[PDB]
Amino acid sequence: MRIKKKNTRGNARNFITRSQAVRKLQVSLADFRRLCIFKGIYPREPRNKKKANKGSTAPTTFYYAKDIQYLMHEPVLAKFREHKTFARKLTRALGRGEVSSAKRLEENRDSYTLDHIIKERYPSFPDAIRDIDDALNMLFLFSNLPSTNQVSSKIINDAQKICNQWLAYVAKERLVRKVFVSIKGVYYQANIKGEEVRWLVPFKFPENIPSDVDFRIMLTFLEFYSTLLHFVLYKLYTDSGLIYPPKLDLKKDKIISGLSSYILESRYDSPVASLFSAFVFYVSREVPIDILEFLILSCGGNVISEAAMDSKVTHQIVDRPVLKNKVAGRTYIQPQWIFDCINKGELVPANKYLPGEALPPHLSPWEEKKLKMIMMSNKQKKLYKKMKYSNAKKEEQAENLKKKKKQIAKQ
Amino acid sequence: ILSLLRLVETNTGVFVKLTKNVYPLLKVIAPYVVIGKPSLSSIRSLIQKRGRIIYKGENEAEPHEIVLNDNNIVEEQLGDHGIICVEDIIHEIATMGESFSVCNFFLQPFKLNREVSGFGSLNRLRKIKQREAESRTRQFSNAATAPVIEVDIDSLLAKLN
Amino acid sequence: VKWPEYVRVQRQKKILSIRLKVPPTIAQFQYTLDRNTAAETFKLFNKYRPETAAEKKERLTKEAAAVAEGASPKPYAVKYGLNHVVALIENKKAKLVLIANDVDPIELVVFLPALCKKMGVPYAIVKGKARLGTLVNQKTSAVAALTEVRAEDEAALAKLVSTIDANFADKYDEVKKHWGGGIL
Amino acid sequence: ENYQYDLWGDSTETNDHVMHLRAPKLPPPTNEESYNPPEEYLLSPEEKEAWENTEYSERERNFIPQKYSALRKVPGYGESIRERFERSLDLYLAPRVRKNK
Amino acid sequence: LNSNPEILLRKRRNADRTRIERQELAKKKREEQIKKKRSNKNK
């Protein structure tokens, strides 16, 4: 052989720069990143960064060559091109002054579907449920958003619809194990086909949207997770449960627009799923309902709200320092009791949960050696000193918790 | 009338009770406003999605209008009237009570987003479609015996939320 | 700087359009109808868009779907071919003839303003063959005429004639004289 | 009928066959920062400003731990869109490496 | 040495630099929009 050129072989055809990926695809950076979001493609780290370049030490991100080289032939890229053609051919109609032909161009418009993009991403159903962890976190955030000029109302209404479908199913087949109310929101854990998904729901207050965040990146994630959730929910309902999609009662959606609405027709294993059976809870006005009625209906209780007005009831959930009525028939609880009954599973006594007293701390469900240092190498001294510092920074923080507990317990 | 209802700004809502005194003033502003009796979900979703409170900032600044994030803010500003939380505000707004005139001027106005919300390719055509839908779903009577046009607010706020 | 061949050619043609002395049958163009009167001509002309190929197809299938199973006046539109406009003019069937100032061979439309002044047809040289194209479902039109009209638009058209006579033909009586393009 | 068909069916095939599929790592389970915490977690007044002094993204907690007596007294957490947005950016922009801990 | 195989996201660089940059850019486009409103009222 002739002397081969140096920096064109091993790591140079294994990886490519962002610029080289964009150029090779002949696609805009935005659309390159849109496809990258849909396909689940990410930058990868080579063992040599400069052999992955053509010699240069430079701030560079490396994609996998065969990954981009596999993205090139794909229906979604072709449909992006078709959207670009449609865009100019519409503004041709609009810019001239003809409205009827433009309106007709809307009628003769097909759009890209993210159907086949999931088959190649999550080939098995249990793999899709391993992703639904991050998928349900976007979607439940986007339900609790005011619609802006960035994000249309149709987007939020469809996202909220999927959210309500998810909440309805989990409360239907009784698949909750753990709850955790934090400052951030309310965490749930759910054995969905026996693999424990986790997801977060914010509190139902108006959310201050920063102008800092980019509502074009988040919209494509929503666009992928949305379709992914449609296919997941069809699979779940048509396997073990119900018809999809279920209908919604109009005068129920006028009252709550939550979870007691949206009725679903068809044609246990865990202690949590057997709890609250033959119990009827009267949720008061003061507590948030949609974060709580999900849990009651999931375990096996029943809900009658103060809100619905605007019997069999055995417990009332009230958050006031002064409670007015006080009947002999009901038992009076601050919601912390429910948030502990789900976590333990053993029905915690309501003696520490009376209206007017302070709640329990609410835990999450989640010499010679200095002399024998010497005979270690530098490649072992560096590592051992690092492990010593990592244990020290833990133990001193544990000492901080103990010292703070002692300083508070005195007061 | 639009100063009293504090609706100088476009794309802006407010709650009022309609009586025999309120109805004559409604005929004057009818070409400027679109009215209707909302439902419990329209009210409840509107307050938990949008809400302003004009009160003091850090130490000096007064004109901050922020957000209905908390319930302890509700306590500090209302409190003794019987109102403790945001859901209690929803109660006195949906059901006509004593504290309605208290909390109505507490959420001053709402800030509804405009329809379509753009000038471009898709947005101009969608504004054209909606602009011709306006004159069909709303008429200007102009006569002294103008019948007050009431529309579905459940459908309209499905568009504006 | 270094430009392409064609860019240099069209820039050279632009400066050549100015710097030469030009014959008065040309430069009778570019002495054209002003912004208000042009907008007001099109506020009338936009009411008579020739029925686009899609609109004609759907309507004539509506005729078939109705009339085969279970009176109309002649509709008025703008008239837009040069063979047809110079047919309409000289037959005096034209009340307002609109002429583009920018035509690919200039020699095409040079007789037309003076033939309109001959026949007594109230013409207006309007700016843009693209702008004429828009009102007529074509890319370009070179000419647009308005023969007959609905009676609602009749008085507006007659006033459009009188406005164009006063604004265009009276201000540009000097344009039949005077060789254009003596710009230093 | 949109998206109303099963696409998996009897699907046994895993995508983690080529060693190049780096699974996106489910975020760490939340450890003791609830609306009602044991108040030793509640931060000292000096570290409240020291935490605010540190630059973002080189910071242990994305939040100040806070104590609340009532569940009604829990504020709407303002920096929630920021957290999901930053996670979304962490998925497609942050380089994924196979490590041995 | 009894090591557990797992995946690790490296810290996305220039996160703070771009964060502050977008914070500034948003405010700048707001102010430019206001200046456009006033200058259009002079027409």
From Swiss-Prot, chain A:
Chain positions covered by the region annotation Sufficient for interaction with ERB1: 51-366
Superkingdom of source: Eukaryota
Chief subcellular location: nucleus
Domain BRCT: residue ranges: 271-355
GO molecular-function terms, A-Z: ribonucleoprotein complex binding; RNA binding
Bias type Basic and acidic residues, positions: 392-401
Database matches in InterPro entries: BRCT_dom (IPR001357), BRCT_dom_sf (IPR036420), PES (IPR010613)
SUPFAM superfamilies with a match to the protein in the record: BRCT domain
GO terms (BP aspect): maturation of 5.8S rRNA from tricistronic rRNA transcript (SSU-rRNA, 5.8S rRNA, LSU-rRNA); maturation of LSU-rRNA from tricistronic rRNA transcript (SSU-rRNA, 5.8S rRNA, LSU-rRNA)
CDD domains: BRCT_pescadillo_like (cd17709)
Start-end of Basic residues biased regions: 379-388, 402-411
Keywords: Coiled coil, Nucleus, Phosphoprotein, Ribosome biogenesis, rRNA processing
Cell location: Nucleus, Nucleolus; Nucleus, Nucleoplasm
Annotated Gene Ontology cellular component terms: nucleoplasm; PeBoW complex; preribosome, large subunit precursor
Family: Belongs to the pescadillo family.
PANTHER family per the UniProt record, alphabetical: PESCADILLO - RELATED, PESCADILLO HOMOLOG
Subunit relationships: Component of the NOP7 complex, composed of ERB1, NOP7 and YTM1. The complex is held together by ERB1, which interacts with NOP7 via its N-terminal domain and with YTM1 via a high-affinity interaction between the seven-bladed beta-propeller domains of the 2 proteins. The NOP7 complex associates with the 66S pre-ribosome.
Protein's name according to its UniProt entry: Pescadillo homolog
Taxonomic source organism: Saccharomyces cerevisiae (strain YJM789) (Baker's yeast)
UniProtKB/Swiss-Prot annotation, chain B:
Subcellular location: Nucleus, Nucleolus
GO biological process: exonucleolytic trimming to generate mature 5'-end of 5.8S rRNA from tricistronic rRNA transcript (SSU-rRNA, 5.8S rRNA, LSU-rRNA); maturation of LSU-rRNA from tricistronic rRNA transcript (SSU-rRNA, 5.8S rRNA, LSU-rRNA); ribosomal large subunit biogenesis
Keywords from the named record: Acetylation, Nucleus, Phosphoprotein, Ribosome biogenesis, RNA-binding
Keyword Ribonucleoprotein: no
GO molecular function: mRNA binding; RNA binding; rRNA primary transcript binding; structural constituent of ribosome
One cellular component (GO) term of this entry: preribosome, large subunit precursor
Main location: nucleus
UniProt modified residues of type Phosphoserine: S117
Family listed: Belongs to the universal ribosomal protein uL30 family.
More details: Present with 7720 molecules/cell in log phase SD medium.
Function (record text): Involved in the biogenesis of the 60S ribosomal subunit. May act as a specificity factor that binds precursor rRNAs and tethers the enzymes that carry out the early 5' to 3' exonucleolytic reactions that generate the mature rRNAs.
Protein name as it appears in the record: Ribosome biogenesis protein RLP7
UniProtKB/Swiss-Prot annotation, chain C:
Keyword flag Ribonucleoprotein: yes
Gene Ontology CC terms: cytosol; cytosolic large ribosomal subunit
Compartments (UniProt record): Cytoplasm
Keywords, comma-separated and alphabetical: Cytoplasm, Ribonucleoprotein, Ribosomal protein
Function: Component of the ribosome, a large ribonucleoprotein complex responsible for the synthesis of proteins in the cell. The small ribosomal subunit (SSU) binds messenger RNAs (mRNAs) and translates the encoded message by selecting cognate aminoacyl-transfer RNA (tRNA) molecules. The large subunit (LSU) contains the ribosomal catalytic site termed the peptidyl transferase center (PTC), which catalyzes the formation of peptide bonds, thereby polymerizing the amino acids delivered by tRNAs into a polypeptide chain.
Assembly information from the UniProt record: Component of the large ribosomal subunit (LSU). Mature yeast ribosomes consist of a small (40S) and a large (60S) subunit. The 40S small subunit contains 1 molecule of ribosomal RNA (18S rRNA) and 33 different proteins (encoded by 57 genes). The large 60S subunit contains 3 rRNA molecules (25S, 5.8S and 5S rRNA) and 46 different proteins (encoded by 81 genes).
Family, as annotated: Belongs to the eukaryotic ribosomal protein eL8 family.
Protein name per UniProt: Large ribosomal subunit protein eL8A
The organism of origin for this protein: Saccharomyces cerevisiae (strain ATCC 204508 / S288c)
Covered range of the whole protein: 50 to 238 of 256
From Swiss-Prot, chain D:
Region of interest (Required for interaction with NOP7), ranges: 1-80
Localization: Nucleus, Nucleolus; Nucleus, Nucleoplasm
Subunit structure: Component of the NOP7 complex, composed of ERB1, NOP7 and YTM1. The complex is held together by ERB1, which interacts with NOP7 via its N-terminal domain and with YTM1 via a high-affinity interaction between the seven-bladed beta-propeller domains of the 2 proteins. The NOP7 complex associates with the 66S pre-ribosome. Also interacts with NOG1.
Role played: Component of the NOP7 complex, which is required for maturation of the 25S and 5.8S ribosomal RNAs and formation of the 60S ribosome.
Additional observations: Present with 2680 molecules/cell in log phase SD medium.
Family per record: Belongs to the WD repeat BOP1/ERB1 family.
Name of the molecule in the record: Ribosome biogenesis protein ERB1
Source organism of the structure: Saccharomyces cerevisiae (strain ATCC 204508 / S288c) (Baker's yeast)
